[PDB]
Amino acid sequence: NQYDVIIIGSGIAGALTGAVLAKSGLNVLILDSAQHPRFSVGEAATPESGFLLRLLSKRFDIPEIAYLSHPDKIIQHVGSSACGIKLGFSFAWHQENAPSSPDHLVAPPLKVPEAHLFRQDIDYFALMIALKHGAESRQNIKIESISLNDDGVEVALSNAAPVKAAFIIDAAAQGSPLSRQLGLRTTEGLATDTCSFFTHMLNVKSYEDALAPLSRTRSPIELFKSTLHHIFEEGWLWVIPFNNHPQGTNQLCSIGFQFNNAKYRPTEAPEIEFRKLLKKYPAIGEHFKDAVNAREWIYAPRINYRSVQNVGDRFCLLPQATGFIDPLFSRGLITTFESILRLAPKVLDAARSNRWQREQFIEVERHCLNAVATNDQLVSCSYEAFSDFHLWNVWHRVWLSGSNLGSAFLQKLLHDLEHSGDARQFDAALEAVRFPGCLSLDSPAYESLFRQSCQVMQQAREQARPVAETANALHELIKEHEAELLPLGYSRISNRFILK
Ligand SMILES: Oc1cc(O)cc(O)c1
């Protein structure tokens, strides 16, 4: 065995995984069929992924990882093109055959700013961290075959000798090449069935210029400085600027749109489908009067999948290779960084004791498969809440209250790790959470609210209930549980901009 671990994929997941393991004294080999620089999506950072990056940084003593958690540190250390800013998520509702109202808006702001990750620059910087810590990288290779045995892993490569290792990690946000070989990938059982078109554009107007200024919306933040979601019956469109930072030099804006395939199936080329969508929703079209594509539109007819298994004796699929649901709420990155945090110490224990059995990595699988299941519920119920604004206003508080509890929990673990400096206590605290993969992590009150809310949403879809009743049902449930949530005034429905 030439190496200890082989990592497929050299984007942010595999790069950070290689960084922490190489730092810890393993001989890592990162493999990739693509080569840097390259384009990538999964751009919206969240407070959770912010804390999880700072946790990775502190747990393994790699300060450069912490730089990726804050837009000012990104600009300073990665580069001035490497991110835009975000002061919150924001959602603006629309319907076919009616003018869009700037009062049909929700946008809960952040205290601490976050990044819109320009992934080509962030991913390359991440690989840099890995390379500087001893990990070998090989780009632009083709994997003929992967063989899993009792004594190791062997990877065959085109125009090169095969490479042997103790363990293999699949960190490809790609078509899960190892999961496709193992036959673990499936669409069966997913509530979500969504397609996606996405690209980067130039000369995209801000929300303030194109639809409605700050004086009309009454928002505490510019929507230009937010992860903007345009939502409507059959799906949603994102507007994620990289050109909204005062110190930034990036001119592009990420643009993507998703359809619920149960409601609408696209039939034509992306650019035709794009012009049809803007005719249907003319207010959304005001963003793109002067706009130009800076790259080819990528179409993906089915973005949703899950896996029945993701760990074995001598392999592990990281969440991005295990399953994906939807870019909505940007749960992809959260699941990924948390999985690396759980997996890394166990792979070290395995390598330091030469024990490679499925049993050891079983809590990595539990977290990952739950996170994809919870993310499926969240998104599918959210796609149903798109049908009316008032319903969306009440529903988004379910996501928000959970997300806040998740964040506060990760602050607690970060604060306790910073104080005590005890890596063993942290690993155990993380594994001992009552609801791994779920939004709150360790709150029985919230997971009660989430479960019953999703039951109300899925019942409302099945029986086609009136939106005013469903909204009230959820409003009651929020009032019932509000004492156990944080004191942010979630039940006050007239407040559409929930402060901290
Ligand atoms: O995007 C987010 C906004 C907010 O106010 C809280 C949170 O956890 C996420």
Q: What is the DSSP track for 309-338?
A: --B-SSEEE-HHHH-B--SGGGHHHHHHHH
Ligand 1 atom with the shortest distance to the CA of 406: 8
Ligand 1 centroid to Cα of residue 108, in Å, is: 7
φ, ψ for residue 86, nearest 5 deg:
-145, 130
C-beta pairs of 346-349 under 8 Å, 24+ apart in sequence: 347/5, 347/21, 347/26, 347/167, 347/169, 347/316, 348/21, 348/24, 348/26
Ligand 1 centroid to Cα of residue 474, in Å, is: 20
- 175 labeled binding residue: yes
- Beta carbons within 8 Å of 365's beta carbon, 6+ residues apart: 309, 310, 311
Ligand 1 centroid to Cα of residue 89, in Å, is: 7
3-state secondary structure of 96: coil
Q: Distance (Å, rounded) from C-alpha 390 to C-alpha 353?
A: 57
φ, ψ for residue 9, nearest 5 deg:
90, 125
Rounded to the nearest 10 degrees, what angle do helices 12-23 and 47-60 cross at?
A: 20
Burial, 366: exposed, middle or buried (Cβ in 10 Å; 0-12, 13-18, 19+)?
middle
The first and second tokens of residue 425, run together, are 């206590």
The amino acid sitting at 188 is: E
**Cβ–Cβ contacts within 10 Å for residue 491, how many?**
17
Tell me, in Å, the resolution of the deposited structure. 2.6
Ligand 1 centroid to Cα of residue 446, in Å, is: 16
- Beta carbons within 8 Å of 197's beta carbon, 6+ residues apart: 256, 257, 258, 266, 270, 273, 274, 297, 298, 299, 300
Exposed e or buried b per residue across 74-97, where buried means at least 16 C-beta atoms within 10 angstroms of its C-beta: bbeebbebbbbbbbbbbbbbbbee
Ligand 1 atom with the shortest distance to the CA of 500: 5
Q: Distance (Å, rounded) from C-alpha 331 to C-alpha 448?
A: 20
Ligand 1 atom with the shortest distance to the CA of 109: 5
- Helix ranges (DSSP H) in 421-496: 423-431, 444-462, 467-481
- 4 labeled binding residue: yes
- Helix ranges (DSSP H) in 133-227: 177-182, 207-210, 214-217
Q: Distance (Å, rounded) from C-alpha 437 to C-alpha 325?
A: 14
Exposed e or buried b per residue across 318-327, where buried means at least 16 C-beta atoms within 10 angstroms of its C-beta: bbbbbbbbbb
The first and second tokens of residue 448, run together, are 């009660």
Report the length, in residues, of the chain.
Answer: 500
**Which residues on adjacent β-strands are paired with residue 197?**
257, 299
- 333 labeled binding residue: yes
Give, for ligand 1, the residue of 46, 226, 240, 443 to mutate: max count of ligand atoms closer than 8 Å to Cβ: 46
Q: Distance (Å, rounded) from C-alpha 483 to C-alpha 55?
A: 29
Q: Find out whether 370 and 438 touch, Cβ atoms under 8 Å.
A: yes
- 269 labeled binding residue: no
> Would you state the torsion angle of the CA atoms of residues 356, 357, 360, 361, taken in this order, to the nearest 10 degrees?
90
- 32 labeled binding residue: yes
φ, ψ for residue 258, nearest 5 deg:
-120, 145
Ligand 1 centroid to Cα of residue 278, in Å, is: 29
Question: Could you give the number of structural domains in the chain?
Answer: 1
Burial, 270: exposed, middle or buried (Cβ in 10 Å; 0-12, 13-18, 19+)?
middle
Ligand 1 atom with the shortest distance to the CA of 114: 1
415: containing domain: 1-500
Ligand 1 centroid to Cα of residue 397, in Å, is: 10
Q: Distance (Å, rounded) from C-alpha 124 to C-alpha 419?
A: 32
Our answer on whether the CB atom of 46 is closer than 6 Å to any ligand 1 atom is yes
- 180 labeled binding residue: yes
Ligand 1 centroid to Cα of residue 500, in Å, is: 9
- Beta carbons within 8 Å of 155's beta carbon, 6+ residues apart: 6, 31, 143, 145, 146, 147, 162, 163, 164, 165, 168
Q: Measuring CA to CA, which residue among 209, 327, 233, 328 is closest to residue 281?
A: 233
Q: Measuring CA to CA, which residue among 32, 26, 30 is closest to residue 4?
A: 26
**C-alpha dihedral sign at 406, 408, 412, 415:** positive
Q: Distance (Å, rounded) from C-alpha 33 to C-alpha 178?
A: 13
55 sits in which H/E element = helix 47-60
**C-alpha dihedral sign at 285, 287, 291, 292:** negative
Q: Distance (Å, rounded) from C-alpha 85 to C-alpha 66?
A: 17
Q: Distance (Å, rounded) from C-alpha 429 to C-alpha 97?
A: 52
Q: Measuring CA to CA, which residue among 364, 349, 352 is closest to residue 315?
A: 364
Burial, 18: exposed, middle or buried (Cβ in 10 Å; 0-12, 13-18, 19+)?
buried
Distance, CA of 226 to chain centre: 16
Q: Find out whether 33 and 142 touch, Cβ atoms under 8 Å.
A: yes
Our answer on whether the CB atom of 226 is closer than 6 Å to any ligand 1 atom is no
- 342 labeled binding residue: no
Phi-psi region of 96 (alpha: psi -120 to 50; beta: other; left: phi over 0): beta
Angle (nearest 5°) at CA 170 between 169 and 173:
145
In SS3 terms, 406-432 reads as HHHHHHHHHHHHHHHCCHHHHHHHHHC
Exposed e or buried b per residue across 225-252, where buried means at least 16 C-beta atoms within 10 angstroms of its C-beta: bbbbbbbbbbbbbbbbbbbbbeebebeb
Ligand 1 centroid to Cα of residue 77, in Å, is: 25
**Which residues on adjacent β-strands are paired with residue 156?**
145
Ligand 1 atom with the shortest distance to the CA of 110: 5
Q: Distance (Å, rounded) from C-alpha 130 to C-alpha 134?
A: 7
- 251 labeled binding residue: no
Our answer on whether the CB atom of 89 is closer than 6 Å to any ligand 1 atom is yes
200 sits in which H/E element = strand 194-202
